[PDB]
Write a protein that binds this DNA or RNA. Structure first.
Ligand SMILES: [Cl-]
Ligand code: NA
Ligand code: NA
Length: 315
DNA sequence: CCGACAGCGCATCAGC
DNA sequence: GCTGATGCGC
DNA sequence: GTCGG
């Protein structure tokens, strides 16, 4: 319907983030791309799209040019620009953001081949991102996510049977494919020691986790792989306090639109919900002490809301 | 006219 | 060495 | 870039 428009907006978003380093213009184009993607009609004019929330004057003007010419003069020029397209491309490497990409291009490093010739100028993360460049851009079929889940849950239980692990993200919402695996971890002995390390070690022991990007006491980011050769996959593991676990599960399950709506409804009932806690609000608007949470449904019960299955949390 | 737009965990950089 | 800023991913 | 105080 409007693929030509949403592609254009997506491309504009990328160049704003990676070349212009204007993160809010990036999110503005993405927000516009998303709302247009769910618009059940073929857009005939910028004025029509202007009615949608997130689409303003400038984008409406760009849609008019696109619908009349089939292209964008601004986009065409940016594409033909060697510097801008090189900067934009290098950010596809995990660990290379707008700043690093600009740094590399400024000194003649513009291609993936150039990066491989200059390993001494890359940090650990960037080297790993370079090593699995192709694999990291591949989607993860749900069936593979299921196998990965079985391994995570099994090994976690072997370290300590009192651990609780939950694979969130779009996967928990029942998506047919995922971009990565986000695991939320907790334990009754950890509330608001060295628990994350023991779990990472075990997954390394059975050779599920193959590489480490970042690792601390509460968050692990690394690379994993199913036993055969399957592509290497990005995996994150977060260690969350027990009294904050299910608020975390709710938060990282999403979606973003769903969370925004649930937070809105919560406020109308006299509660405030963030990533960590759900708090009651006083008459003056003062937030009280964290309320006890033992399940996802408890959060729904506090705000007098019908429990939404993760499969129906797209909005 | 003009500020909000999410912000935390970790690695790395800038400066003392 | 330290503390705080910046970069990055999600 | 868009929205809203
Ligand atoms: Cl911006
Ligand atoms: Na609009
Ligand atoms: Na990147």
């Amino acid at each position: 319907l409007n693929g030509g428009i949403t592609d254009m907006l997506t491309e504009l978003a990328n160049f704003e983030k990676n070349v212009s380093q204007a993160i809010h213009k990036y999110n503005a184009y993405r927000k516009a791309a998303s709302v247009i993607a769910k618009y059940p009609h073929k857009i005939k004019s910028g004025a029509e799209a202007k009615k949608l929330p997130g689409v303003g004057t400038k984008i409406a003007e760009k849609i008019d040019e696109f619908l009349a010419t089939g292209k964008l003069r601004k986009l065409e020029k940016i594409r033909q620009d060697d510097t801008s397209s090189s900067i934009n491309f290098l950010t596809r490497v995990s660990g290379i953001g707008p700043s690093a990409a600009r740094k590399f291009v400024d000194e003649g490093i513009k291609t993936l081949e150039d990066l491989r010739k200059n390993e001494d100028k890359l940090n650990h993360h960037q080297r790993i991102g370079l090593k699995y460049f192709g694999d990291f851009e591949k989607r993860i079929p749900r069936e593979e996510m299921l196998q990965m889940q079985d391994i995570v849950l099994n090994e976690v239980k072997k370290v300590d049977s009192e651990y609780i692990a939950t694979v969130c993200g779009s996967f928990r919402r029942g998506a047919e494919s995922s971009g990565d695996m986000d695991v939320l971890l907790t334990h009754p002995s950890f509330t608001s020691p060295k628990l994350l390390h023991q779990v990472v070690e075990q997954l390394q022991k059975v050779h599920f986790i193959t590489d480490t990007l970042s690792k601390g006491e509460t968050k692990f980011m690394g690379v994993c792989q199913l036993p055969s050769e399957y592509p290497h996959r990005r995996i994150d593991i977060r260690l969350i306090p027990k009294d904050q676990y299910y608020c975390g599960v709710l938060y990282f399950t999403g979606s973003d639109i769903f969370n925004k709506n649930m937070r809105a409804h919560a406020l109308e009932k006299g509660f405030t919900i963030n990533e960590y806690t759900i708090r009651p609000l006083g008459v003056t608007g003062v937030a009280g002490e964290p309320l006890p949470v033992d399940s996802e449904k408890d959060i729904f019960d506090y705000i007098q809301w019908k429990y939404r299955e993760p499969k129906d949390r797209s909005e």
